[PDB]
């Protein structure tokens, strides 16, 4: 038994004309979502966005869609992102590292997107049900039989 399912990671960034009072030059938004017409809430319990230490309360949790964070800042950084599953066995979660980069003056706003495919070996029937409700496919080996004589 094998279940394959997909996730989307992305972010948008925009250069401000006039910086904020804190000197922030960009407004940005980072998100986790499913492919077109796939509600990952079926199998995702929560998403934790680990912002840089310079933000207040940088451990940002989304327990329900939209799974996203909207902020303002002056510099890009690598953002660890944890997608937690509605699963009582391991794996309980999956960890990504996302490059939240900002655009230079003269380049268009950022609209970056990533597609990630998760593969689970023999998930519990309850969890595999949730994955198949969100665009997954289940694959099960069977006994093969040849079509010709020898």
């Amino acid at each position: 038994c094998t279940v394959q399912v997909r996730l989307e990671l992305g972010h948008r960034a925009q250069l401000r004309k006039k910086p904020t009072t804190e000197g922030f030059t960009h407004d940005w938004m980072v998100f986790v979502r499913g492919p077109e017409q796939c509600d990952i809430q079926h199998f995702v319990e929560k998403v934790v966005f680990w912002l840089h230490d310079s933000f207040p309360k940088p451990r940002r949790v989304c327990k329900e869609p939209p799974y996203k964070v909207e902020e303002s800042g002056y510099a890009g950084f690598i953002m660890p992102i944890e997608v937690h599953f509605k699963n009582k066995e391991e794996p309980r979660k999956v960890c990504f590292t996302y490059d939240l980069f900002l655009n230079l003056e003269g380049n268009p706003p950022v609209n970056h997107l990533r597609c990630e495919k998760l593969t689970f070996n023999n998930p519990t029937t309850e969890f595999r049900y949730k994955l198949l409700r969100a665009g997954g496919v289940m694959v099960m080996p069977e006994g093969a039989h040849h079509h010709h004589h020898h």
């Binding site: 230490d53 310079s54 002056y74 510099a75 890009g76 950084f77 980069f101 655009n103 230079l104």
Partner: peptide, 6 residues
């Protein structure tokens, strides 16, 4: 651009 680190 400038970046931040951990």
């Amino acid at each position: 651009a400038a970046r931040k680190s951990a």
